[PDB]
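ARCHIVE RECORD
Type: protein–small molecule complex
Small molecule: zinc ion
Source of inputs: curated submission
Record status: active
Notes field left blank by submitter.
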Amino acid sequence: LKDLVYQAFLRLGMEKTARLLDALKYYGFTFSTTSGITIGIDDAVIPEEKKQYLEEADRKLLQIEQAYEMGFLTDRERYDQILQLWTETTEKVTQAVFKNFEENYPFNPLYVMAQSGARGNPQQIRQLCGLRGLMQKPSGETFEVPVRSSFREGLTVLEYFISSHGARKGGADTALRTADSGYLTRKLVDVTHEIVVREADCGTTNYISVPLFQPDEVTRSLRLRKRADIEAGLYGRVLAREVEVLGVRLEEGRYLSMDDVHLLIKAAEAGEIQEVPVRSPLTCQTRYGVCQKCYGYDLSMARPVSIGEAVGIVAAQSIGEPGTQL
Amino acid sequence: KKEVRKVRIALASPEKIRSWSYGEVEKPETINYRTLKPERDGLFDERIFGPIKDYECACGKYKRQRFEGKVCERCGVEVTKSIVRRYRMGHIELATPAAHIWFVKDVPSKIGT
Amino acid sequence: AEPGIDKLFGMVDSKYRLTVVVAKRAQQLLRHGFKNTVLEPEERPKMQTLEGLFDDPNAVTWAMKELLTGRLVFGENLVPEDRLQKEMERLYP
Amino acid sequence: ILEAVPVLPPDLRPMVQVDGGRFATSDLNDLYRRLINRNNRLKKLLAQGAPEIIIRNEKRMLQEAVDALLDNGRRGAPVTNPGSDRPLRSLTDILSGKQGRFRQNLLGKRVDYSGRSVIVVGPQLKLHQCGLPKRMALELFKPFLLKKMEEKGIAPNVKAARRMLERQRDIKDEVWDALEEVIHGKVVLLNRAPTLHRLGIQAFQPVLVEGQSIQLHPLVCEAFNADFDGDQMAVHVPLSSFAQAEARIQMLSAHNLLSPASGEPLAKPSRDIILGLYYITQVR
Amino acid sequence: MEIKRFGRIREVIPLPPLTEIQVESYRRALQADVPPEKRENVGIQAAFRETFPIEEGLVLDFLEYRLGEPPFPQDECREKDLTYQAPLYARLQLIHKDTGLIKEDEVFLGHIPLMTEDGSFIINGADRVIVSQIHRSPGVYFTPDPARPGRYIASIIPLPKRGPWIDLEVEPNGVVSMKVNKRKFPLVLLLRVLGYDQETLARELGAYGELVQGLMDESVFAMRPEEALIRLFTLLRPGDPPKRDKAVAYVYGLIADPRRYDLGEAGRYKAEEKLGIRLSGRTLARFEDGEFKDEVFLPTLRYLFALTAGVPGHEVDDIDHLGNRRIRTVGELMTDQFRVGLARLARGVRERMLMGSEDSLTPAKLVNSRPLEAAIREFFSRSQLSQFKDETNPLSSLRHKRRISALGPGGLTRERAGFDVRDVHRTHYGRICPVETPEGANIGLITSLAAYARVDELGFIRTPYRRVVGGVVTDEVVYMTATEEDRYTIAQANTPLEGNRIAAERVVARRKGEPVIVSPEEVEFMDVSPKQVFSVNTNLIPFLEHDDANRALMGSNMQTQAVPLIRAQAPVVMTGLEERVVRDSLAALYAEEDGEVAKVDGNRIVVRYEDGRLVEYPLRRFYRSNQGTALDQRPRVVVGQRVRKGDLLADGPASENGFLALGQNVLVAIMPFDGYNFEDAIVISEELLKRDFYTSIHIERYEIEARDTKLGPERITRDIPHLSEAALRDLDEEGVVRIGAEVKPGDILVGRTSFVKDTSLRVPPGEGGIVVRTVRLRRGDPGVELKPGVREVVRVYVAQKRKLQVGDKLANRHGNKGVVAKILPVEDMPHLPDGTPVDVILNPLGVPSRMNLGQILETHLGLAGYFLGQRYISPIFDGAKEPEIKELLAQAFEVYFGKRKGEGFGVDKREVEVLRRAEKLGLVTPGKTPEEQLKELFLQGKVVLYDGRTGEPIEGPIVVGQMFIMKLYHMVEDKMHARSTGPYSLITQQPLGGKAQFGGQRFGEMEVWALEAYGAAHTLQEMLTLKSDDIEGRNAAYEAIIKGEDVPEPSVPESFRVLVKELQALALDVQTLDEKDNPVDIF
Amino acid sequence: MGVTKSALSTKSWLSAASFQNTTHVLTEAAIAGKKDELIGLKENVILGRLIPAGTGSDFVRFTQVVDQKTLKAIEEAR
DNA sequence: GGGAATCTCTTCCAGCACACAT
RNA sequence: AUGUGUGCU
DNA sequence: AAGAGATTCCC
Ligand SMILES: [Mg+2]
Ligand SMILES: [Zn+2]
Ligand SMILES: [Zn+2]
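STRUCTURE (tokenized, with ligand):
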């Protein structure tokens, strides 16, 4: 739906995509009430293989434990052993949760939520039907005994207690940084307010080559740069010298749409261009300001950036908004 | 001179100090508790600053808008609203010269350097 | 959405140009009588109680639906400053 | 070295009656007072006699007193006689600080034509508009409503109309209809709690709905991060026709369908919408 | 009605009196109870003899003390801005060095606040309360060395903040470093002060770890008895070497700096029971013949070597083992401040000896009334530790007392150190709730005490543990400390038991605070009941085991704002604490002794005690809570009935027949509905409004003062100088408005003038309502405060009842917050096949993402509850389960459906269709009969539902049932702003004031940044001046719109032209040049 | 240099006058007639003039719109 | 002439609220 | 008008 | 209050 809206936006227009949006907002509701999607105690269908995934875990640990008592592995070693054991156990049970639905219960009220863009999350659904993993001790370590039960069944006295430890840390990680929302945006705004796109074009021809290959995943192994990164380093920008690739010629000083980047990645998969020449604020001429060709697209839409936009403020804010999510 | 472009800041000579001044506060007088009118050529006098009233003067020879840019023959009262009061400066002629502490007390001595 | 805004945003160089145009149009349209409108016979914005938007409810609506037609022309320097103001109060009440 | 001391204009230092006869005088008056008290005591002194102690001590007194007016605090702290141990806010202090004349307009300033309330879903209205309660609409648009009420057979003139809306039970059909006649295309600004990114404030066209809380469209929730569990949103009105023009063009919700951060639709279907859609487009 | 409990863990002991931490502390803190000859040296009394015999001819002495008859009663203090305190007398005699003994008992040397039987002290005409604090218990501890994991360091903490902070560190070199104040030095020198010889020392320390070499030495440095003083002073207090050090002795001695924690209590018991063996006096100073002696220093050194060497019995202290962290109770805070006051009193009595005339000076020349006053006064009224009593409901008030804080007097906890301290440590089990901690910022620094938990004088929390004999559970409850809990193996309460004997081969246990599964023998203790882990508010949540820890937090923190509803309902699914909650919280009134009913009035209930006594009880209808709600007591027995001792007679503000009623039992259907339940917004039946289900009663107290100004004496009169008699139709009394009248926004409440313009008191733009009480404190005031200058105050109690409207905040016990969105009328609402509509509609999309399956279960049980007409009691972890709930549901189904099957109706076509779809869904089994299909659905809590506005059945069964929902203390009308143009201020032109307008909304940097970002220069500028601080243009716009013309922009920017003037004031010149550098006029 | 070390020393002393120590910002620039090029936003906002961007951008601010009925009347006397 | 220590000055955070206190 | 405290976001 | 920077004193 998101991608559909994005495409219909730059195809049908803005004022139209509004109406499409509200149509979806209408129909989707009206149907979501007819569907009868509800949440019952049974709805959170526990996977069938639970007892076995635990059994094969238990009958595993019983052996490993002995190896310690005999004196084979060290303390650290078995600590990491139990770790691998339950780390794999929970992940495996998760698959049983997500598969039991898809096979026997295609239209599970708890499944359709987590699946589509609605509320829900993989490892979260894992907690309702399957079991919670090993929780965190007050320190950086982990309890060697994981919460072997689910929220649907009775989560025992002591288990809740050992989950509380990380549970309270969560609050700090979010609530201690609800206040830091004004801090980064502030610091960045101070150095940026002077920047605004008040030019048509500059007299310079300096660019940068945004690389299409990440050199540093393993030791030194060159490979395709992430599907996401490339898009945000090339979308709505301006070249500095024409470059033909897959069979179509990209104009000189052209406002690349997303598809431009798409076919570029496709061409780079075959062994064509390693980099792309591009104008950027990094190399403008305008003392206080940045020109039109240098900035690029974004104007709450996919249009050439208007002459006179308050860009510095906008950029600062867009770096600031998701600061607290770290 | 209709379009304000840029602003400069610089020290001011005695001349330019007095240039914005429209008279000397030669008394430490504010306001009488009885007559809320200004006192003895001090801080609120209409002669140096502006008319405490709107378009009307001190005594009342001239009272309305018809004679907008005129000063009375017997007492000097040229009148816009209570704005001319709030936009005109007065000054004080010190006996012995005194230095601006701003240029004295600083991390770098603007005068001791 | 608003009356065909994609035609508008494209009708100019910068998106803000449009805002200033629409604005000043509304201004001179309200100040010098609501009669210097360029599409008042049949193709004209209207309201719901009676049909009395023909007079003066909104100033901006009229500007936006005005520029939609090739009746006016914007620009940097078109008319001498003072003259415009004077003759715009002469030709209308 | 300034040998002439410029005095601030009056109203910038309001010697003003507050309540009961209490007089708030900006401390600058009390500061300019002693400056004269020592100035004329130094000038007069040169005339009669001329002792070194008396006159020089006087020169020190003057040099100190004028400094008090300029930058208070660099040498002790001049205070009003026992009652307030605070130093007088000197000219240097009338600027530097949270409540000054540099940090002033930058962060402060309380708006006039405005308000706020608790947020609620607005199912039966589009992105172009939003739900705003009646009382708010009347108050926020008091003057426009006055004039338009004069334009019709609702009130004789301005003042009688002002007296019309005085008590709360006077609001009749006439007034409401006229109030719809004052807005039409008029758009209002809606603000979130911690505003963070550009899309933190969205313009909508007011819709006179009942209730008391502010009704807002579902889609723009994720925009300025708003959930329906007790949050508070504010509201203003761009009065100037220029401000109206910019507001409904670049600040309107339906025209900001993408995030300035990344080319991703920030008004996409959400919690309920998606569930409903997904439910009807799958195979059994 | 009726009740069915499921809980099968026999609570072997009832829950302790909840408000005891506040009360018992205060009662033990003063010998006002028992005679001034009796025991209880501690508290106030202790503080006396610490700074009492002030030897110099000056020798005072503790000759008893007594006080405790208040100036004014419980409620009259609340009305007249006074303190429910008592004058402090205390008998004091003086003994001179020579002969003569002058005495003068009672000295009015200050006041001291008493406490209500609930735990609040009415200070300054406002119900306030002091919470409890947690800090490191002053004593000796051994913690590892920061940078070096090789050796360790000792620790000697003694509160208060004045009093040294002593550490002992074996410096890697070998030498032992004494750390006092902060500075370090060879500890051996101080060892030599105390009269230790190289040999004796070499023995005692030499015992084991050779490390004694490190200190045993210093031959040239430690070969002098009393010179170690003379040299220590030189090296510690850079100054003169006479006898000043022989006096500083006392400072590291007793009485003064070090802690005065009695001989046998804190310092003692902590020291001995943890480390060392002996304590000879409160702190370290035994000075027979000027000489010194010590006992702690040597065991500290001994233990230090032991730890930093071999294994003399495992010596490792844990900084937050909780067996190391005291809890300053209310009485301790009080007595501490009392000591502080007595100290300055002592300073005064020292100062005055030089200003004495002759000999005698006991009463009048010496002991004054300032230090004690300053001590007891600034505490109850300026302390960060004491606050407003949160009285939303009785339960919330109950919670606020039992809460523990870290944030305190600065000397212990800071507001710049968290994240690590806040985390749930191990020992909090059974002692502190890992859940109650209020969310948001400042989290974790405030934690309520666990349910069964209770302070043991010594400060450490004690947990009730049932010890066991080998294999049999003993019926003995030992209250253990954290330091003592880890020393055992305790089993969970869920463990299978036969009467008192274990019945499982594998017993779930916990060793030193960690899950270990052991055998039935190694059990030595046992958890009483799973209800002991959580703070009572969390104990008020059914099926807690099925809610996330985060959700349960909010759930436990929701009750603390549950507005008392006029018709409140006890939970349909409860835990069992409720009944105890109402009684321990002093909500309602119970019976004191057996007998019959005399007179059930709406103002009184008279009781027939068999001992010829009828005692009078007030039933108090409308008493304004500290928060804004109302506290009502309503009778529950009828005239001519036999009651029992401890049986209720009326209900509290939050009680239904003696249970905790914090809300309603509404029939809720959980399903998506249009967009009205988007996010967490909540659809609601109009029906609930028709039968006033959610309705409160708020009383907004207004006021005014009659200050006697000199320009013109202000005075209250029934005279409003300028206009109408119509506005005075309410003004009954001469100046005062009538009681029982209706006041509206703008209505005149009080009439009075000053210099003659009207400066009366009118009803603000919010709302008035109906006046219920009018208090007036005239000049001829029978003993009141009254503020300076003021002649008389006029306070008004305007009450009003508000119904549930769109915008109010709704939530449950499981933690789902959410505003109301739309109140759909009865017609177009989801209704069962039976003519029964649903009350509330909750979006299911709010359930999985937070994992609180609790609501689902309370709903499931709530189905059977609705159709069988019987509520339930489900304990914390011994509550109901699936087989049980499903089973009861099967029972209710027989009613719900059998009625129809008999009546002459059956399976509706719609029901048929829904069933048909439910088959493909996979809830029902294919093959059974429609009735059986519906049975299967009704087992899973789900049931057919009709659209209501169409009659088309919701294709798909959804779960319905009655869950518990309160209305939160927030409302909408409390928060409502909508002013266009109104008051400003003379001091600042930025608009605010509540005459006829609310207040101008704030515009921060975050907003200005947004407007700037858009590029809305006109809107921004218009916002920053035109509608704010620019006055010249303000009226320009205001005049413009009046005529229907456009808002004129400001040609000349105001804040500019003002700043020019401000900058010209100095020697600075602001020249506004043109484009090509030319001066430009601005004026 | 860092963001804050950079912004701390913009030529636009109007800015640093707000956040930084006012007395030094004014003092240091007073001695040397510093022309505040009223360009920065925060700079030009202290004063109260419309902001140097968006609808206030020089590129846009100076713009006029007229119709033929006036275009002609002006066209004559031109 | 350099390095270390001590003292002084400046920074000091997102929003509303209700409170009290000075 | 500043500080303390709590509540919500 | 806590941290950073500047000034002064001693090696
Ligand atoms: Mg929220
Ligand atoms: Zn460029
Ligand atoms: Zn005259």
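CURATOR ANNOTATION: The first helix of chain B runs from residue 14 to 19.
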